[PDB]
Paper text:
Noroviruses are highly contagious, infecting both humans and animals. In this study, we determined the P domain structures of four human noroviruses and one [name] using X-ray crystallography to examine structural features linked to potential interspecies transmission.
The P domains of GII.9 (AY038599), GII.23 (KT290889), GII.27 (MG495077), GVIII (AJ844470), and GX (MF373609) were expressed in E.coli. The five P domains were structurally equivalent with a root mean square deviation for C-alpha atoms ranging between 0.586 Å (GII.23-GII.27) and 1.645 Å (GII.9-GX). The cross-reactivity of the P domains was determined using direct ELISA with a broad-spectrum human norovirus Nanobody (Fc-NB26) that binds to a highly conserved region on the P domain. Subsequently, the [name] could be considered antigenically distinct from human GII noroviruses.
Numbering used by the authors:
A (entry chain A), B (entry chain B): 226 to 522
Write the structure that this text describes.
Amino acid sequence: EPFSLPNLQTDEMSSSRWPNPLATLFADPNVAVAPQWQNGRCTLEGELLGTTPRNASWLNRFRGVSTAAVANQVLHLTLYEPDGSVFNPLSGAPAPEGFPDFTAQEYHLRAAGKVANTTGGGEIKSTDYTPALGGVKITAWDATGPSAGVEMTGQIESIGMENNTDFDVLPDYNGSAFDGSLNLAPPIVPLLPGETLLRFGTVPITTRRQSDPIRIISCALPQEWITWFLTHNFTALGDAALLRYRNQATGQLLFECKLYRSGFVVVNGVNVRTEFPMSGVFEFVSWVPNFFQLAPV
Amino acid sequence: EPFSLPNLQTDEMSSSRWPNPLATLFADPNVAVAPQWQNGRCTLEGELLGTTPRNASWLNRFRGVSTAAVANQVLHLTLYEPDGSVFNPLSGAPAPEGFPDFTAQEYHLRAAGKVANTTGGGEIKSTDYTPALGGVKITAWDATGPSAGVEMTGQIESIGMENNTDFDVLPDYNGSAFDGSLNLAPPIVPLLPGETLLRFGTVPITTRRQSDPIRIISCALPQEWITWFLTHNFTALGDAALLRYRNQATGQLLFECKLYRSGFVVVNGVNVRTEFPMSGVFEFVSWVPNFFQLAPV
């Protein structure tokens, strides 16, 4: 089938790195380092990359089994994948599908099992966020159960986040500074030098906002585009899909952009951080080579 | 475009009444009263009913403005709709789009504003769950702010839920002991007497499970099907779409069912509550009239 994108406005779509509606659309050419996001990554031909979950709703969800009974507000889980199979550290994955792919001081959560007295809240402290090792230690856990051997499923709800730039810093998934053995999706770098990554932004709930209160986490593809690629049998006939971003109510063509086949969008001619209207729709035009030069925004 | 459904397995899709992956698929013929869900409602031609949000990720999200500074762990919010427009409580809508459409003792939440000391947790007690009035009183609010006139955005994360049957009991949205002035989408009723509603189930996190720990909330359509109908220009050439539910790996056809044009699925010949495998895909077969009688499961 010929390539297309869903006829949804940006503000009708969802982040693929934090479950929430998209709220901003912007290009920032002065970010310190290129992002290496592990969620929200998919090729145009429908190949998921990194820890990107195939089920949209497994983003920020987790499943596991308690390794010991709760004591001293500590719950340790051996981690499973969304399919219920055991997560195998030896596979090279940094974490089960859908796990957070950025640095934070705390990851706040809620969880429950299928038996009584297992609904609780807690958090994973940064030093304990080492899912590549096969488990996570949940602290400040406020339920009396579970006992050992009980399946738990939960949701990461918010983060302790003192510094917004840490959304673009991968966590120490294996508890060390050395990620060489991990099978990580590659950094996102525009192919032409004047191009700037187009960021789809949303607002997560965070604590530790005393220094500066604005929190924005970006992703490369709206979740609805990822699902679109999974539900169509597209062939990437060129290096990039040339798209137009159009306000369908007002007719105004806002800009053209390139959706590279590895799954990210760029615009040209951005010299300072630039925000774009949210009520537009992205429409496919044609396939273009990597060095196709876009009209500046 | 000819009618189709996305090629996702049931366990690869999401509930449209609680944000979480689908976990069960079942038909219960012994539910005495038909459900009147206000979320997860969409015709095959892509027209939303009830409070069903156009953006998948606005389910269980809310936004508004504080009417007073926080005091005594109470935060009162005047509600907005998802698009930031003011929710007019005189209009007859039961709630802003995406608000929970069932009865619970407490609706647990988290929220935050643009300024520091506004990230908190709290809850809406059942007696305060009257969003049709244009606002909600949040209690057990644990942040020191916001002051008055401050925008807040938040998420419903879990419920206090004594009885699973209350997932199918609409709440008293206007606090008037159900007076019938509200604009509600109609009950979901199979058009033939031998048919049973096919329920797409997920597990929300709930408290008050000490006595019966299993909690399952059902919906009429996976969220991904609703988005599919919004992103295609379908014309229902019949009263109902005949579907086959097939395990694509083994090729095993499990049952046939009818997807009625108003947006729900039924099976035939179910005499006891019956669960079905989650690894199947619903495939469109043809259009059939309302009187078409399905092969029994």
